[PDB]
UniProtKB/Swiss-Prot annotation, chain A:
The modification N6-succinyllysine is found at K65, K74. GO terms for biological process: cytoplasmic translation; ribosomal large subunit assembly; stringent response; translation; translational termination. This is Large ribosomal subunit protein uL11. It comes from Escherichia coli (strain K12). The keyword NADP does not apply.
UniProtKB/Swiss-Prot annotation, chain B:
InterPro entries: Ribosomal_uL16, Ribosomal_uL16_bact-type, Ribosomal_uL16_CS, Ribosomal_uL16_dom, Ribosomal_uL16_sf. GO terms for molecular function: rRNA binding; structural constituent of ribosome; tRNA binding. Keywords: Hydroxylation, Methylation, Ribonucleoprotein, Ribosomal protein, RNA-binding, rRNA-binding, tRNA-binding. This is Large ribosomal subunit protein uL16. Pfam families: Ribosomal_L16. Is hydroxylated on Arg-81 by RoxA. The modification is nearly suppressed when E.coli is grown in anoxia. One of its GO terms (cellular component) is cytosolic large ribosomal subunit. Belongs to the universal ribosomal protein uL16 family. SUPFAM superfamilies: Ribosomal protein L16p/L10e. Gene3D superfamilies: Ribosomal protein L10e/L16. The modification N-methylmethionine is found at M1.
Curated annotation (Swiss-Prot), chain C:
It comes from Escherichia coli (strain K12). Belongs to the bacterial ribosomal protein bL36 family. The gene is rpmJ. InterPro entries: Ribosomal_bL36, Ribosomal_bL36_sp. It comes from the Bacteria. GO terms for molecular function: rRNA binding; structural constituent of ribosome. PROSITE patterns: RIBOSOMAL_L36 (PS00828). One of the last ribosomal proteins to be assembled in the 50S subunit, it contacts a number of helices in the 23S rRNA, acting as molecular glue. The simultaneous presence of uL16 and bL36 probably triggers ObgE's GTPase activity and eventual dissociation from the mature 50S ribosomal subunit. GO terms for biological process: cytoplasmic translation; translation. This is Large ribosomal subunit protein bL36A. It holds the Pfam family Ribosomal_L36.
Curated annotation (Swiss-Prot), chain E:
Belongs to the bacterial ribosomal protein bL25 family. The keyword RNA-binding applies. One of its GO terms (cellular component) is cytosolic large ribosomal subunit. It comes from Escherichia coli (strain K12). This is Large ribosomal subunit protein bL25. GO terms for biological process: cytoplasmic translation; negative regulation of translation; response to radiation; ribosomal large subunit assembly; translation. Transmembrane segments: none annotated. One of its GO terms (molecular function) is 5S rRNA binding. Part of the 50S ribosomal subunit; part of the 5S rRNA/L5/L18/L25 subcomplex. Contacts the 5S rRNA.
Amino acid sequence: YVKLQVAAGMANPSPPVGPALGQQGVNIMEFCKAFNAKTDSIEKGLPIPVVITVYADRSFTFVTKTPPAAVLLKKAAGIKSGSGKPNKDKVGKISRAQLQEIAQTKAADMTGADIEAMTRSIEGTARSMGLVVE
Amino acid sequence: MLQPKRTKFRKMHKGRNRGLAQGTDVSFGSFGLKAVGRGRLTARQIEAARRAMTRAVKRQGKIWIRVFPDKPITEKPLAVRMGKGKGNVEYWVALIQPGKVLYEMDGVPEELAREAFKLAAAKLPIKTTFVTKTVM
Amino acid sequence: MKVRASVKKLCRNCKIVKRDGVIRVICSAEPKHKQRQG
Amino acid sequence: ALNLQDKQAIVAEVSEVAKGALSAVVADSRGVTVDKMTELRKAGREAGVYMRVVRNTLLRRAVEGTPFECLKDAFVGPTLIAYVTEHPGAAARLFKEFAKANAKFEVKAAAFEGELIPASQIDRL
Amino acid sequence: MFTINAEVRKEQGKGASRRLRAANKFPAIIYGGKEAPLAIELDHDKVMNMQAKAEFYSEVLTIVVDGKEIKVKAQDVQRHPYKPKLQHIDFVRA
RNA sequence: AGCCAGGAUGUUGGCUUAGAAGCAGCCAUCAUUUAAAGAAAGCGUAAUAGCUCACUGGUCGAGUCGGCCUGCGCGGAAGA
Ligand SMILES: [Mg+2]
Ligand SMILES: [Mg+2]
Ligand SMILES: [Mg+2]
Ligand SMILES: [Mg+2]
Ligand SMILES: [Mg+2]
Ligand SMILES: [Mg+2]
Ligand SMILES: [Mg+2]
Ligand SMILES: [Mg+2]
Ligand SMILES: [Mg+2]
Ligand SMILES: [Zn+2]
C-alpha cells in the first residue's frame, strides 16, 4: 500500500520509482506503462500522484488521482517553481476561476463539502508556495 | 570592557561597602536583574554576563547595563614586601549593595527573559533575582 | 555515571530519585543521563 | 481544554439541533480511522445528516432537552450521534451498512417518536 | 473595587515600624485635604495581593478605619529593596 | 495518573537536493472533514515506510497542578 508522485507520461527511472515500490513485490513495467497509458492525458511536466494498492498475490490496483494542488498552482499561475520565500517573496498569480478549476480537479480529489471548501484548500496551497490570488 | 575614560585621581581608598542600594526599580526596560547580595563587580564579570544574555536573546529586544565599574583596585605582584607605596592598578570594579538593578531589558517575551537572566547570573559572584517594572 | 554536585533532568524521560540519601537521576531512554550526586 | 462556558454553549448547540431534528441514532465510534469517518461525514452532509461525537455527561444535559431522554442509558460507552435534520431515516440505514462495511464498533440504541429502539430492531428505520 | 481594612496607629518611629513589619503588618498614611493626617497600619498580605493588580494605582479605593471609611488614591509607595515586600504607602484623600 | 480508541485531506506545501515525503537545510504554516489531529514534539529511512507525542472521545472516580514566602534538615565536603 504505497504512494508516489510520477511525471505525466513517464515511468521506470531507477531512483524515483523502481526500488521504492519494487521492494514491495510489484511488477515494475505494468505499473510503468499502464500508468503512462492512463496518464498520457495529463500534460507533460506535471507530476501526477498515483496510489498503488498491493495485495498478498502481488497483483496491484492503482488509483491515479488528479495532479497536486502545488502542481496545478505552478501551471495555473504560469510559473515553473513556486517561492523559496512564500508570502514574503510571491512568484505568480491566479484569478478565482483557476482556484475553482484546480478545485474541480481536486473536487474529484478533496474531502471538501462545497467547491468553496476545495477552493479554500487550493487557497491554502496558494498561500503555501507564495502565489498571489488575483 | 567598561572603564572610566579619564579620572581625577589614579588610585582610591579601599572604602567600605555598607547600607543599601539606590535605583531599586526598573526605569527603562520591562524586566530587570536585581542583586539580593552585596559584592564587588569587576568589569570582566559585567562584560561576560552582558555577553551571555546577548547570546540568549539572539540580539533582539534591548539591554541596558545600569552599573558601572568606576573604582580602581590595586595589587602588588608576587614576592614583594609591604610598603614602598601603593600597588599598581589592576582592574576596575563597581560596588554593589543589596537591591541594585544590574541590567534592564525589554522588547522580549517574559519567559525568555527569565531565562537569559539566569544565564547572565551564572557569571556573577552575587545573589540575584528577577524583577518586573511596576506602575508607581 | 556522571557524578557531580549539580544534577538535572536532561530530557522528559529522566526521573529524579533519592536512594539511600543520595540524589540520582535515572533514565529509561538514555544510559548517558545516569547521574549521581557527589 | 473546555471551560464551563464552553460546555454550556456546546450543550446549547446539541440541544438546539436535537429540538430541530426529526430522528437520531446513537452508536459506538471506537476503533475506526478518520478516513472512513470523513467518508461517513461526506455520506453525512450528502444525506442531510448532522454527525457528532459529544461528551456523555454533556449529552445528559442536552438530551434532558426532550424527547430523547430514553437515550440517557445509551450514553455509557463512547458516543457518536447522527441527527437527521433532513428526513427521518438516512442515519439508521447508513450506520448499519457502515458498521457492516467496517465490522468495527457497534451502533447500540436509536430514538424515534420519543421512544428508544433496541439494536436489532433499528431496521424499523 | 478595593476595600482595605485598617487600624489607627497608637505608636510611631523606627521601633514601632519595625515591630509592625515583624508582625506581618505595615505602616501607611492618609493625608491631603482640609483634614489632619491619619497614620494607620495594614495587613501586608492582603494589600500585597491587592496591588498585584494595576487599577489599585489608578483608582479610588476605600479604607475601613474604626467603622469609618475614607476614599483615597495611591500616592507613592516605598518597597523593601530586594524582597517581595512593602515598607509603606502614601494615601492621598480622594 | 493509568488503561481502550483515533492522531485525518489538500499534500511529497513551495524552496533545495541524486533524495527532503511533518521531521538536512530555507521560507511560509493556510484551508478542509473535525470529538480532536502542530504543513508536526522526538526515534526512524538513500528518501519513504515504521514508532510515540501535541489533541480529543471512552473507562475511572475526588481532589490535583506549580510557583511565591519562610522554619529545620540533605548533597556539594579529600591528608598525612
Ligand atoms: Mg567613611
Ligand atoms: Mg549614594
Ligand atoms: Mg547499597
Ligand atoms: Mg521622635
Ligand atoms: Mg533603633
Ligand atoms: Mg486523564
Ligand atoms: Mg487549589
Ligand atoms: Mg554536608
Ligand atoms: Mg573521597
Ligand atoms: Zn533522559
